[PDB]
């Protein structure tokens, strides 16, 4: 679950780097945080607020930061992302 | 694992007998609770509110093994207990992510003489 | 986020919603009584004097038709607070009609909120008011009509501002216009179609004037009193409604804070157990 | 940051034992607890509630308890303490 989002993102970069356009959709990412939180707690790492690791931000950022619009010289390709998030009580 | 035991009995009829099964399971709260207790004893760091880090995985296995196949189907009717009446609690929250329908039993209907406990409006 | 504080504030809103819900029950109970009294006393001798005066053809020929330059405003409002927006509506309209032109209205208020609300905006204009009415009845309405009669001599016209109880949930402001005593007598002497000899005209003119004035006052109080209980009930419903929504919202934050509390304390124990 | 409060406190004891009057003003002590907490955590000591050391109470008590009104036999000196505390949200 932790690696699936990055695996799919690489498939989208293919179309991006070849001048093509791709739209990658990421189902609810809270599942990834739980999966990553699982591995973190099992690694004896110190949990932060809401039991999430301190690098949970970098987990999602590094992924979404790769989805962008390449210039025309490189091919003009793009990679659209539609991350989903589930809110417990709509807060 | 007692919950998985009944599931294995149902999976036999699903695959071999090829007939539909109806798996009744007590309130899943005690199932998730037992998974948290065994995890704590083994020395795993608990989750935010004391649950095991493998909540999604431990619960996902049970919720995924229950589905329809080409041979048969296993319809599971399991009770849901919300601790402290907190819907945002991890146990009921992760469970609702898999539930397709809900049967809410109301106490008022019984008093009026109508004794299907299911509520028409609350049920979805 | 300091669960102890949130739980206390939730308890407060719960009591407010409780007392707010209870006041609505009493609001409905009293509304039933007022409507029962209104339906029985309504249209009591209303327009009677106005009708016969119209039937008097000779009166219309000699009718003195002029525009009153100075008039007296007697707004009717409820005395008990937290009764709804009916009082705010009356004090608002009279404020507009009064702020526009000053020194042309006496503004004798009726009701604690009506007079108190108009005290600061119009000082030195309103000199006396009537409040703390124990019950509504014709003898009392006559005493009020009599007082207005004494104060109406200085002004050329008198009008009453009050809420009209058209429906249990719809109360529209309505204002009647009554001529003073001096204008009434000079108009009543022309009465010739309807003979008055059992009591002589000199006595009948002053007597039927009371009936003409008390009838309007008595009817106005009922309409306003019924609107009070009606608007009060609606206000408690909206208040109890809003009280519940906020109470439910804090409950979510309470549960959210509960999870964070267990998370914080649990990590402290794990941190100490790690070493 | 951990010794500055006690450091200045010793300077006040001079005027105290010499029959003089001194006024010491300790700025926000929560910053001292963070420095004292930081100093304790880095020493690999077991942390207490809120990650602070167990004897954090003894810290401020030992510091503030020195302020007193010496009797006339020692000169009648006095040391007055005005410690400051910053609250997060008035809690």
Task: Explain what this protein looks like in three dimensions.
The structure is cut from a larger assembly and holds 2 copies of chain A (91 residues), 1 copy of chain B (124 residues) and 1 copy of chain C (275 residues). Chain A is α+β, with helices and mostly antiparallel strands and 91 residues long. Chain A is built from 3 helices and 2 strands. Chain A has a two-stranded parallel sheet with strand order 1-2. In chain B, helix 3 runs parallel beside helix 4. Chain B contains 5 helices and 2 strands. Chain B is mostly helical. Chain C has a 3-stranded mixed β-sheet with strand order 1-2-3, with helices on both faces. The chains are: A alpha+beta (91), B mainly alpha (124), C mainly alpha (275). It is classed as membrane protein. The entry lists the keywords mitochondria, ATP synthase, F1Fo dimer, IF1 dimer, membrane protein. Cryo-EM structure of Tetrahymena thermophila mitochondrial ATP synthase - F1Fo composite dimer model. Chains A, D: subunit alpha.
User: Beta-strand percentage of chain C?
Assistant: 5-15%
How many strand elements of chain C? Answer: 3
Q: Over the alpha carbons, how many angstroms does the gyration radius of chain B reach? A: 17 Å
Alpha-beta content class of chain C: mainly alpha
Number of helices of chain C: 8
Count of strand segments of chain B? 2
Q: Which structural category do the helix and sheet elements of chain B fall into?
A: mainly alpha
Largest sheet of chain C: 3 strands, mixed
User: Helix segment count of chain B?
Assistant: 5
Helix content of chain B: 40-55%
Q: What distance separates the N and C termini of chain C?
A: 28 Å
Can you summarize the main beta sheet of chain B? 2 strands, parallel
Percentage beta strand of chain B: 5-15%
Percent helix of chain C, as a range, is 55-70%
Radius of gyration of chain C: 28 Å
Distance between the termini of chain B: 30 Å
Strand order of the largest sheet of chain C: 1-2-3
> What does the overall shape of chain B look like?
flat
Order of strands, widest sheet of chain B: 1-2
PDB class: membrane protein
Keywords: mitochondria, ATP synthase, F1Fo dimer, IF1 dimer, membrane protein
Entry title: Cryo-EM structure of Tetrahymena thermophila mitochondrial ATP synthase - F1Fo composite dimer model
Chains A, D: subunit alpha
């Amino acid at each position: 679950q932790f690696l699936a989002p990055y695996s799919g993102c690489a498939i989208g970069e293919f179309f991006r780097d070849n001048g093509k356009h791709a739209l990658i959709i990421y189902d609810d990412l809270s599942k990834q945080a739980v999966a990553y939180r699982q591995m973190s707690l099992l690694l004896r790492r110190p949990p932060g607020r809401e039991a999430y690791p301190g690098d949970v931000f970098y987990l999602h950022s590094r992924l979404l930061e790769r989805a962008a619009k390449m210039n025309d010289s490189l091919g003009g390709g793009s990679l659209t992302a539609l991350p989903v998030i589930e809110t417990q009580a709509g807060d | 694992r007692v919950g998985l035991t009944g599931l294995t009995v149902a999976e036999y009829f699903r695959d071999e007998e090829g007939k539909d099964v109806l798996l009744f399971v007590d309130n899943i709260f005690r199932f998730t609770q037992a998974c948290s207790e065994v995890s704590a004893l083994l020395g795993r760091i608990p989750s935010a509110v004391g649950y095991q880090p493998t909540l999604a995985t431990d619960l996902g296995a049970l919720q995924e093994r229950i589905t329809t196949t080409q041979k048969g189907s296993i319809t599971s009717v399991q009770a849901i207990y919300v601790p402290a009446d907190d819907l945002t609690d991890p146990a009921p929250a992760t469970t609702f992510a898999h539930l397709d329908a809900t049967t809410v039993l109301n106490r008022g209907l019984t008093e009026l003489g109508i004794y299907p406990a299911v509520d028409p409006l609350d049920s979805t | 986020a300091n669960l102890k504080q949130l739980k206390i504030r939730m308890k407060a809103i719960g009591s407010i919603k409780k007392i707010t819900k209870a006041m609505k029950m009493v609001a409905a109970s009293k509304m039933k009584a007022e409507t029962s009294r209104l339906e029985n006393g309504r249209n009591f001798a209303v327009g009677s004097v106005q009708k016969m005066l119209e039937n008097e053809s000779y009166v219309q020929k000699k009718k003195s038709t002029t525009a009153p330059k100075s008039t007296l405003l007697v707004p009717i409002t409820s005395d008990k607070g937290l009764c709804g927006s009916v009082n705010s509506s009356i004090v608002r309209e009279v404020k507009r009609l009064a702020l526009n032109n000053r020194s042309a209205f006496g503004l004798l208020p009726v009701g604690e909120k009506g007079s108190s609300g108009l005290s600061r905006p119009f000082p030195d204009l309103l000199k006396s008011s009537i409040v703390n009415i124990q019950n509504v009845n014709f003898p009392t309405a006559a005493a009020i009509a009599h007082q207005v009669s004494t104060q109406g001599a200085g002004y050329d016209q008198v009008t009453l501002i009050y809420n009209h109880f058209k429906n249990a949930i719809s109360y529209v402001v309505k204002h009647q216009e009554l001529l003073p005593r001096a204008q009434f007598l000079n108009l009543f002497k022309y009465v010739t179609r309807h003979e008055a000899v059992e009591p002589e005209l000199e006595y009948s003119k002053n007597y039927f004037f009371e009936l003409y004035m008390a009838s309007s006052v008595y009817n106005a109080l009922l309409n306003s009193s019924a609107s009070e209980q009606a608007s009060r009930m609606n206000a408690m419903e909206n208040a109890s409604k809003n009280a519940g929504e906020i109470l439910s919202k804090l409950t979510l934050d309470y549960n959210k804070a509960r999870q964070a509390k267990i998370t914080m304390e649990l990590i402290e124990i794990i941190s100490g157990a790690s070493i």
